Amino acid sequence: APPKSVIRWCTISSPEEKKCNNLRDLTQQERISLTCVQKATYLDCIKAIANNEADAISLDGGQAFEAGLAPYKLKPIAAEVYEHTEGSTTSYYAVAVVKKGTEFTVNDLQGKTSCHTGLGRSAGWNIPIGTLLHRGAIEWEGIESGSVEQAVAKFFSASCVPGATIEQKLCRQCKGDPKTKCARNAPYSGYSGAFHCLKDGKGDVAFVKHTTVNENAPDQKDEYELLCLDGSRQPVDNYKTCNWARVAAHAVVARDDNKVEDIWSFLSKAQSDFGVDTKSDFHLFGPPGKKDPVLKDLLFKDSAIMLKRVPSLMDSQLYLGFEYYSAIQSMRKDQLTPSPRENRIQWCAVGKDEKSKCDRWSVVSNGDVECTVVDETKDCIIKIMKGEADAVALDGGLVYTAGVCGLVPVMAERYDDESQCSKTDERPASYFAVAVARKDSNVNWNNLKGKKSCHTAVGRTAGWVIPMGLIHNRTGTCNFDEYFSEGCAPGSPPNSRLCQLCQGSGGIPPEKCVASSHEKYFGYTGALRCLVEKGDVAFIQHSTVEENTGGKNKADWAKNLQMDDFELLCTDGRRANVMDYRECNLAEVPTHAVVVRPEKANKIRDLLERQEKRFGVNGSEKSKFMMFESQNKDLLFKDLTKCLFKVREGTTYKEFLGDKFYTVISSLKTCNPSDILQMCSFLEGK
């Protein structure tokens, strides 16, 4: 079978079942198909979808959440983009303004009066009264002793949220009629109205929408400038930098399994074709014709332009983000079963050698170090990114993908001596990359293509993520395994081609070319080796030549070896001494670094800088167990490390790498894009 289907959209109210039936024609006369469907609710629908019954449903914030939840499990495979003035649009930022000379942050509003769009709302009520419940602001959890609504009263000493009935202290900052004022259909509410509360004097803050003060008085502002989460306070046109949560446009929710594109497509075509720019009596996203509140956003919000896409890895904690996904989960979706209150540092160990190195440490550490086992160490990213994880010490290469993902550097390792760290007169450790060529070989970067090169391992930055970096600044299609004649980059496929030159296996089941020691060329020292016997190059550490050479590697192969015998290939064509390393290197690489979220950072560096004293080399409780120990290896952190220096605040994923070594590890991926890097990049500027 190839690719031919007849999709069946769900609905809600009747009107939309027909338009969802007014296109079903050209559908026939066109590659795939439809078949409308209707049901009292957006819910009965989602249900309907996990029952192998339906197709998909464009659902907004709330709808998008519940969509992909237990009992069901749904996810986005499309997203309504729209129009603006800044960047592309797949959102709508939410904020909480304040009058200048702010007499508060977000770290003590415990009391002041509020202004709110209403209740059961997002911009207002939800993210505001639903973010303070997560962070801690409002300390209720089990509504039987501080029921949100009842819990919001005891925070501020009022409000004007147009949802009466319950809540005493929570409507008094209103103003209208002494009967129809705490009334939703009133007017000192909403967002515009929400201003008519924070601009008058009643209350203190107004949680409005991205750009409204703007819709209001695009003149005045200085009187009321925003209020960030990070105890900060910015200007007003600067939202993307000072919000509580961003809301992505209403996706296109569908069943995660097979027939996927049979929707992308049945959308894809419908789109480009019956978009809003073709000529066949009818608008899909409909034109922006305001009408009976009834025929509104009929299957696609009016004000939308094109159900873009939505990659693979995106679940629903993602497409929504941490801000709104969690804020919410604090209310309904949860409150204590999974999501609980852990003010300790969780962590990301990978494999039965990391978690092991974990449920060993989370002991005198007295659980102040939860642990979330991880299959693949590329998983830790989606892990922390969502919150279920608290940290991870990453490989420079990944500190790139992570960075694209939203995470950030905290503190980088340091293997020299802890005999330095406590200060900042000294900058980063000077550890470089290096192409190492033999004494006399027609080999210079230019002649590269055709020669037998020798790597350190499939990945390990120096031996693969940095050489196959520059290269791809000359080798578009990235058949890395088709650049050099032959080679040995341990951890390559079986048969492979770059995995040939290896001589691995001691002698038994020829484990020829594996990423272990079981081989005779894994790592630096051994790859270097290679370059002697057969090799024609060697992308290695700078100090890897002075280690094996100089009567230090008394093996019969480096018995008499000496740096005097090799030379490093610069990209220039130039070939400096083996030691003129700093003036001829493939890249300058930074140390791994506990990545985490910029939301909970300053404390992670704190609860990490305090977790060394008890456990950690010069950590008095050493008889117990240093956190860098590893039964003799590199689990969790490293081993050799001595002090985990702290990188200066306000850094970035770029800055720690440089822009010289980030360019390549960045233009190296341009090549083959993966789930994460491709999943995080999307949202990025979406």
Curated annotation (Swiss-Prot):
Keyword Acyltransferase appears in the UniProt entry: no
Cysteines paired by S-S bonds: 10-45, 20-36, 115-197, 160-174, 171-182, 228-242, 348-380, 358-371, 405-680, 421-643, 454-530, 478-671, 488-502, 499-513, 570-584
Positions bound to Fe(3+) 1: 60, 92, 191, 250
Cellular component per GO, a single term: early endosome
Induction: Up-regulated by dietary stress. Increased expression at day 14 in the magnum of the oviduct in the corticosterone-fed laying hens (at protein level).
GO biological process, one term: acute-phase response
Pfam families: Transferrin (PF00405)
Superkingdom in the source lineage: Eukaryota
Residue ranges of every copy of the Transferrin-like domain listed in the record: 7-333, 345-670
Sites where the protein binds hydrogencarbonate 2: 456, 460, 462-463
Binding-site list for Fe(3+) 2: 395, 431, 524, 592
Post-translational modification remark: Different forms of hen transferrin are distinguished by their carbohydrate composition. Ovotransferrin and embryo serum transferrin but not adult serum transferrin, have bisecting N-acetylglucosamine. Transferrin secreted by embryo hepatocytes in primary culture is marked by the presence of (alpha1-6) fucosylation of the core N-acetylglucosamine. Serum transferrins also differ in the number of attached neuraminic acid residues. In both embryo forms, sialylation occurs on the Man (alpha 1-3)-linked antennae.
Tissues expressed in: Expressed in the magnum of the oviduct (at protein level).
Keywords: Allergen, Disulfide bond, Glycoprotein, Ion transport, Iron, Iron transport, Metal-binding, Repeat, Secreted, Signal, Transport
Annotated GO MF terms: ferric iron binding; iron ion binding
Keyword Ion transport part of the UniProt annotation: yes
Residues reported in the UniProt entry to bind hydrogencarbonate 1: 117, 121, 123-124
Glycosylation sites: 473
Spans annotated as Connecting region: 333-341
Compartments reported by the entry: Secreted
Family, similarity comment: Belongs to the transferrin family.
Function field: Transferrins are iron binding transport proteins which can bind two Fe(3+) ions in association with the binding of an anion, usually bicarbonate. Responsible for the transport of iron from sites of absorption and heme degradation to those of storage and utilization. There are two forms of hen transferrin, ovotransferrin, found in the ovoducts and, serum transferrin, secreted by the liver. Serum transferrin may also have a role in stimulating cell proliferation and is regulated by iron levels. Ovotransferrin has a bacteriostatic function and, is not controlled by iron levels.
Oligomer status and interactors: Monomer.
Protein name (database record): Ovotransferrin
